[PDB]
Design a binder for this molecule. Structure first.
Ligand SMILES: O=C(Nc1ccc(Oc2cc(NC(=O)C3CC3)ncn2)cc1)Nc1ccc(CN2CCn3ccnc3C2)c(C(F)(F)F)c1
Length: 268
């Protein structure tokens, strides 16, 4: 039953706090922090992890959402290893994920334009990053799950250079979502087209010369993100289809993933 499936997911997600050791702080914000850590596994050995730190009803919502995320199983979606709840002199929820030395995709693109960072990224690799994101989003959308914050800063790079969707912004929000609270999978499609543009420009902020407060009017007048300098005509047509006024006219993630795979195969 629906209840039975919920109680099952719930028992699996909690990690005993004594199996975790916390290290140094990697990042900080208003909502919480990211630290490096060690997780003791079933086989007696330890794994390097990333630990994200952040009333009974709010904690219950956190545990419920974490239980759903752990249930996801796809190579292009970040895997949730588990959760811990600490206590202050206010409850402190912690989320445990595998450590990815290359970090977020947005930072990686920027570093590639500098001499000491990763090397220049060729066209074929930029397209492969897009195919990877489309594969992760296709898995999530088929299971009726909404991301709501898709952007290059929320995509992570694995050690084998595979990209996976994760979640640690007016310029990424669909035209219908700015006019009303309305948010569907076709709104994640719009955010995906903007993400493809960030990858193709190697990390540029969307809509140069356009301020956040003048965004809704800009789109209402039919203007969209401009074609990047070295971007193929066929790739621009794919990203432009993500920004069609009527959400029903926009392609699904499954249709996008196939268009992107066919384009990559056609390259020499
Ligand atoms: O990804 C998540 N957390 C996360 C990710 C990376 C991280 O940090 C790191 C860092 C590093 N490495 C480094 O920093 C190296 C360079 C130094 N390695 C690994 N990890 C710390 C935390 N959580 C997450 C939360 C929500 C959702 C989707 N939804 C849930 C329910 N829900 C309900 C309404 N909206 C929603 C949203 C998703 C999903 F994947 F499914 F998209 C994921």
């Amino acid at each position: 039953s629906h209840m039975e499936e919920l109680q099952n997911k719930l028992e699996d997600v909690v990690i005993d706090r004594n199996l975790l050791i916390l290290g140094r702080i990697l990042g900080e914000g208003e909502f919480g922090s990211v630290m490096e850590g060690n997780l003791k596994q079933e086989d007696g050995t330890s794994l390097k992890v990333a630990v994200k730190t952040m009333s009974q009803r709010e904690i219950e919502e956190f545990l419920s959402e974490a239980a759903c995320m752990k249930d996801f199983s796809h190579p292009n979606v970040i895997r949730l290893l588990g959760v811990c709840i600490e206590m202050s002199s206010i409850p402190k929820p912690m989320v445990i994920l595998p450590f990815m030395k290359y970090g977020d995709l947005h930072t990686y693109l920027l570093y590639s334009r500098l001499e000491t960072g990763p090397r220049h990224i060729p066209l074929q690799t930029l397209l492969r990053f897009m195919v990877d994101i489309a594969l992760g989003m296709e898995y999530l959308s088929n299971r009726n799950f909404l991301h709501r914050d898709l952007a290059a800063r929320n995509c992570m790079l694995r050690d084998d250079m595979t990209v996976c969707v994760a979640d640690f912004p007016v310029k990424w929000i669909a035209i219908e979502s700015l006019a009303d609270r309305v948010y569907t999978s076709k709104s994640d499609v719009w955010a995906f087209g903007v993400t493809m543009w960030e990858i193709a420009t190697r990390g540029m902020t969307p809509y140069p010369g356009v301020q956040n407060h003048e965004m809704y009017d800009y789109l209402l007048h039919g203007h969209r993100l401009k074609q990047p300098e070295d971007c193929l005509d066929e790739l621009y047509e794919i990203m432009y289809s993500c920004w069609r006024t009527d959400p029903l006219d926009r392609p699904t993630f499954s249709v996008l993933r196939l268009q992107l795979e066919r384009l990559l195969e056609s390259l020499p």
